[PDB]
Amino acid sequence: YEDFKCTCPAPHLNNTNGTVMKPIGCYYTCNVTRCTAPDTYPCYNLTEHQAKNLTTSPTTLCAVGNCDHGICVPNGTKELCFKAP
Amino acid sequence: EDFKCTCPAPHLNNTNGTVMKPIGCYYTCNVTRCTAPDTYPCYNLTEHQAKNLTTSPTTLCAVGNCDHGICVPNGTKELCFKAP
Amino acid sequence: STCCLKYYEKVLPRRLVVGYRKALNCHLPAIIFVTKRNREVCTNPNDDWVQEYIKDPNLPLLP
Amino acid sequence: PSTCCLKYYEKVLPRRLVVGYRKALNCHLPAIIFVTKRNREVCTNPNDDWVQEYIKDPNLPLLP
């Protein structure tokens, strides 16, 4: 069944807003197949500094955006991100 | 409720061997008003051309793509007509 | 002279379908199943249930 | 719980294939995640009736 190609969960980050969880990008991997987030789906757009130095504590200010053609287009709003344990 | 927007919609024909394209981006299933998928190809007609549309290839239709339910013309043109 | 804009992704119980049509000169080529209540249901022609349904000789193509 | 779903599995999953489920509701697409025999996580819409009848089953447990 090729219907399971992109029906797998994807890693998401937590926040401190009380808002929905948002991924690091618009692309996610299931098995070996590359999947893309739905268009306008909310996401974080981070720099490489914030990505390699991201921790489990609310310490990073992330640019929030929406998915367009697989790209996280920032919308100007910001949030505190951390990886869930 | 899984049948909300899975019904076929009326589409127009051409003479250049391309896919069939509907009038606008909106179609109705039973009582539900449905919208075409994004980028879906369509015709953008004037009110004049809509009333003067016939079963004969006589009207030059503007071709476009669906964005938020709107047929945004892309600049290309075709002859459209209603099938008998 | 009709085209489909959204696919029915679930499996349609055979007891509901009485026939089928083909709409392939469309941006979304589809096999259109006709149900007992005269409902036309758009399906993907590459799905296996759609293909196994069309192979049924008691499930006819309708002009 | 740190995962969210981006596409729903719209077909019906045979019960004999599923071993458990998880919930991912603080997401833009709230989903019930069924775990299958081969450890596959399958995203489903929580409002679907088949998904809900599966969760009501006491022999189909929520997985930590």
DSSP string across B17-81: S---B-BSSEEEETTEEEEPPTT-EEEE--HHHHHT--SSS-EEEEEEEEETTEEEEEEEEEEEB
Q: Is D63 on the interface with C (CB under 8 A)?
A: no
Nearest to A10 among D3, D8, D40 (CB): D3
B33-45 per-residue burial string, b: 16 or more CB within 10 A, e: under 16:
ebbbeeebbbbbb
Q: Which of B20, B49, B50 is nearest to C1 (CA)?
A: B20
Q: Are D5 and A3 in contact (CB under 8 A)?
A: no
The H-or-E segment that residue C54 falls in is helix C48-55
And the tokens for D28? Answer: 């833009």
What D20-26 contacts at long range (C-beta under 8 Å, 24+ apart), as own/partner pairs, is D20/D60, D20/D61, D20/D62, D20/D63, D21/D54, D21/D55, D21/D60, D21/D61, D21/D62, D21/D63, D22/D62, D22/D63, D23/D62, D24/A9, D26/A20, D26/A21
Report the alpha-carbon distance of residue B62 to residue D59 in Å, rounded.
58
Q: What residues contact D47, with CB distance under 8 A and at least 6 apart?
A: none
And the tokens for B12? Answer: 């127009």
Report the alpha-carbon distance of residue A51 to residue A62 in Å, rounded.
10
- Are the beta carbons of D26 and A21 separated by less than 8 Å? yes
- Are the beta carbons of C25 and B41 separated by less than 8 Å? no
Q: Is D10 on the interface with C (CB under 8 A)?
A: yes
| Number of domains within chain B | 1
For domain D1-64, give its CATH number from 2.40.10.340, 2.60.40.2130, 1.10.10.10, 2.40.50.40: 2.40.50.40
For residue A28, give its domain range: 7-81
Secondary structure string (H, E, C) spanning D16-61: HHEEEEEEECCCCCCEEEEEECCCCEEEECCCCHHHHHHHHCCCCC
Q: Find where tokens 């980050």 sit.
A: A13
Q: Which of B66, B54, B67, B46 is nearest to B79 (CA)?
A: B54
Asked whether residue A22 is assigned to any structural domain, the reply reads yes
Using DSSP, how many helices (H) and how many strands (E) does chain C show?
Answer: 1, 4
- Are the beta carbons of C42 and B6 separated by less than 8 Å? yes
Report the alpha-carbon distance of residue C25 to residue B81 in Å, rounded.
15
Q: Is C10 on the interface with D (CB under 8 A)?
A: yes
Residue A84 phi/psi, 5-degree rounding, is -75, 140
Asked whether residue A53 is assigned to any structural domain, the reply reads yes
CATH code for the domain of A46: 2.30.130.100
Asked whether residue A1 is assigned to any structural domain, the reply reads no
Fold (CATH) for C1-63: OB fold (Dihydrolipoamide Acetyltransferase, E2P) (2.40.50)
What D43-52 contacts at long range (C-beta under 8 Å, 24+ apart), as own/partner pairs, is D43/A7, D43/A8, D43/A9, D43/D5, D43/D6, D43/D7, D43/D8, D43/D9, D44/D8, D44/D9, D44/D13, D45/D8, D45/D10, D50/D12, D50/D13
Count of Cβ atoms closer than 10 Å to residue B51 Cβ: 8
Sort out which chain B residues have CB atoms less than 8 A from C25's CB and list them. Answer: 19-20
Asked whether residue A2 is assigned to any structural domain, the reply reads no
Q: Which residues pair with D36 in a beta bridge?
A: D18
Q: Are D63 and D40 in contact (CB under 8 A)?
A: no
Q: What residues contact B76, with CB distance under 8 A and at least 6 apart?
A: B62, B63
Report the alpha-carbon distance of residue D63 to residue B44 in Å, rounded.
52
The resolution in Å comes to: 2.7
Asked whether residue A47 is assigned to any structural domain, the reply reads yes
- Give how far C35 is from chain B: nearest CA, Å: 11
Q: Find where tokens 């505190």 sit.
A: A80
Asked whether residue A25 is assigned to any structural domain, the reply reads yes
